[PDB]
Design a protein around this ligand. Structure first.
Ligand SMILES: CCOc1nc(N)nc2c1c(=O)n(C1CCCCCC1)n2CCC1CNC1
Ligand SMILES: CCOc1nc(N)nc2c1c(=O)n(C1CCCCCC1)n2CCC1CNC1
Ligand SMILES: N[C@@H](CCCC[NH3+])C(=O)O
Ligand SMILES: N[C@@H](CCCC[NH3+])C(=O)O
Lengths: 458, 458
């Protein structure tokens, strides 16, 4: 709080002296990891003439008369420590260097009684704020978090690897990644309230996408065989531990397969991700426990599993009056009640990775009706560690069914998405699409909160 | 316009008959490209017993008594044509199939007097709109465009390959891809008017990002060595042939290099992209001409090149009164005039790939001051076929300079981005960032308009 000002004084008295505390270029020859990997086993307390120029943040200090010692930490976490050359050097070192400062050191690498002893040295950046964190002050200052807490570094890097692993996996299977509009004249593809924004260009409101599905489906019409899109969607609603207004989401579409096929791919995908990004399918948790995601995953059906849980045959024919009865005895329409009752009974119990499939028609307007069973659609949800993570559909390609479905939805709350429906009636071949939530994915894999999985939330 | 209704009648009279015109699953064993690559050279008018099930859009038809012929076109453009099995089959074929329809055919592949002769056949999707386009009706119905025009297919696929090539190139060089917020409490990183939107969660306006730079720079503070982000930005301004309110943009940041270093990388990157996505650096144009992007690219300086063009020494010292004089004699502040005069004289002439570097301080608040030359910053722009495509900076890591820079900008039009400035004063190491525009990139490579480079504009 005071040291704020002495640092700012250290800046000004360097400019006046004509020593640059924010130089344009310092000749860093090696990352610290490069130096460590280069000199793994080294005779302790012995010299080597490998001259190198390294840089890093001075995090520890121990000044002492003729020799000074400080730990240098590169941005990724790696560490190297630092008569030699000049006395004024040491004077400047003492008087100019503070903790949190970025410094360059040229010299030869030696082994401590793994350090480097300096020919030259320079400031690369002057810190006007010493380093210190509540979980919320962590999020509001991620940049400090990443500097001073290792786990922040590992989580950031893990998200990145997971996202790369996803691209790899889909690309290996012959999927093409596409960019579809964020700004739309009307936002569809999911059930949520949009963010609205006004355009100076057109003097109209546009709406940020809630999902890419409707546009992705146009691509399938247009002759894409296999397409995906990994990017942010926007749902103007409340925040909780599994919901945020902006988050990253994966949609996948594949022609000439069903929800049976996309279920297999989804499993393989998640498993292939663990392998690449985490290295095990026996997933360690902060709990201390281990979650096993290996092998095969159980598939249940919604109506039957709900039936066993309630001890009574529930079907698509079961009335809202009856459902409401059961809803009460525990604590709008048919579909909503089935999913609610199922979630409160079956989905809450689940631990092992589980698919639930065959969903009520009311609440699934974009998914095809089931091939044999009446009253249900070909949709699955994937629960992983009790987290709704992913869905897949046998996609409805029937435009007149689809027009009805929207009309039913519109009257319930009349402007339909006429261009989407127009596209469907040029002919969309049979396909299965999936959605997956990236943070929920990581959450399910790690036990980490949504406020840790993304770099910069609010 | 009438045939709209006969198609819709063909749908209904199939449902009633209990033949599904939008089946969930048809067993397509092979893409058409798979069949073509399998049977390249084949004795013409001879049989082979490779049974396969293919699917595709019936685009050509020629019905004739006992044998019917139609061209099947897969979504990517590949083509295969189609006593045998059943007469009712042929009756249904004639009466049920229209152009634009998606159809499945099982049977053996044979050579035409390269077709397939049918054991079975089924409708996969019924089209209620026959296929037909003005450049604007092309954009509003991309799905039809992609079906009926080959070039639409190739451009879509090229953008995708270019974007993949970019990720490859950066990933090869050890860059990590990061997601930074689209919704911000205040949007910075470039000069443009934001899109504003209201949050129900917080009862405040948020602003869609104009650029990721300020957040990307936090990542560098936080110890990222090499980071990029390829994703859409939003600038609430007018549309023209090189400007749109939503477009895809690449930002790159690398520690311990300057604008000299990022210039080299940018060249290599663009060149490596051409190689992967296009296959030549002798770029063919709709013109008929060829643009050469191979070898080395010229670097000029703004003030000196402007000087030669005007025949008079222009420096950072040259007054607004003088500049305005020259501006008039041809046809606000110093910086703006330099760039304007330069663009109207030098930048308009350029053809070969050219870097212009060393920019006026006023108009470059985020870039470091030049290491030796006074009055200029270390910024370059890359012109490619006379298109402003890309910039790179030696990044300003000096927080007090940076605070001033914003204050000057704010007073000109007082709320600064205090958190960004806070991050800078924990110490950002020397780095160079770049921006590149994806559509301008493709435009510069191909001669294609911005309304062709993206799938779904408006
Ligand atoms: C990390 C924040 O993720 C999410 N935030 C919000 N607001 N909404 C989200 C999510 C989020 O991850 N999802 C889903 C979850 C898996 C299904 C695929 C799409 C993503 N959804 C929608 C799920 C609804 C369907 N029943 C609840
Ligand atoms: C395809 C549409 O691309 C763009 N649209 C808009 N509205 N603005 C764009 C673009 C667009 O591509 N760019 C730039 C061009 C290259 C520099 C890096 C960022 C991208 N910019 C900003 C450039 C200004 C700096 N002087 C003009
Ligand atoms: N838009 C969907 C994801 C794709 C499901 C398959 N069409 C959702 O948010 O639920
Ligand atoms: N945000 C910049 C691109 C990055 C330039 C390097 N800091 C722009 O739009 O011009």
């Amino acid at each position: 709080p005071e040291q704020f000002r002495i640092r700012r004084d250290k800046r000004a008295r360097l400019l006046a002296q004509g020593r640059d505390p924010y130089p344009v270029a310092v000749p860093r020859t090696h990352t610290l990891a490069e130096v460590r990997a280069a000199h793994p086993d080294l005779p302790i307390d012995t010299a080597t003439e490998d001259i190198v120029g390294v840089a890093g943040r001075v995090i520890f200090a121990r000044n002492s008369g003729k020799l000074c010692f400080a730990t240098l930490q590169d941005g990724d976490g790696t560490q190297l420590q630092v008569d030699k050359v000049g006395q004024a050097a040491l004077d400047a070192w003492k008087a100019d260097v503070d903790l949190g400062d970025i410094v360059y050191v040229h010299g030869a690498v030696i082994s401590s009684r793994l350090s480097v002893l300096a020919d030259c040295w320079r400031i690369a950046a002057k810190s006007l704020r010493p380093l210190p964190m509540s979980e919320e002050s962590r999020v509001r200052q991620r940049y400090v978090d990443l500097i001073v807490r290792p786990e922040a570094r590992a989580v950031a890097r893990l998200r990145i690897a997971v996202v790369r692993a996803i691209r790899t996996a889909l690309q290996r299977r012959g999927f093409l990644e596409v960019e579809t509009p964020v700004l739309q004249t009307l936002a569809g593809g999911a059930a949520a309230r949009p963010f609205a924004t006004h355009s100076n260009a057109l003097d109209i409101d546009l709406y940020l996408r809630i999902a890419p599905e409707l546009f992705l489906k146009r691509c399938i019409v247009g002759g894409f065989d296999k397409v995906f899109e990994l990017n942010r969607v926007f749902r103007n609603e409340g925040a909780d531990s599994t919901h945020s207004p902006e988050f990253s989401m994966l949609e996948t579409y594949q022609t000439y397969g069903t929800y049976d096929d996309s279920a297999v791919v989804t499993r393989e995908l998640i498993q292939e991700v663990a392998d690449e990004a985490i290295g095990t399918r026996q997933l360690p948790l902060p709990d201390g426990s281990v979650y096993d995601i290996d092998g095969e995953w159980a598939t249940i059906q919604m109506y039957p599993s709900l039936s066993v849980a309630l001890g009574e045959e529930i079907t698509p024919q079961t009335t809202v009056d009856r459902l409401r009865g059961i809803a009460d005895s525990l604590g709008f329409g048919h579909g909503k009640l089935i999913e609610e009752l199922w979630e409160r009974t079956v989905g809450k119990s689940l631990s092992a990775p589980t698919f639930v499939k065959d969903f009520p028609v009311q609440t699934t307007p974009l998914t095809r009706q089931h091939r044999s069973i009446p009253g249900v659609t070909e949709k699955w949800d994937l629960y992983l560690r009790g987290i709704e993570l992913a869905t897949g559909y046998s996609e409805l390609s029937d435009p007149v069914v689809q027009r009805e479905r929207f009309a039913d939805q519109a009257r319930a709350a009349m402007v339909l998405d006429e261009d989407f429906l127009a596209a469907l009636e040029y002919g969309m071949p049979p396909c299965t699409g999936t959605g997956m939530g990236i943070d929920r994915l990581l959450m399910s894999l790690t036990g980490l909160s949504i406020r840790e999985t993304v770099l910069f939330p609010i």
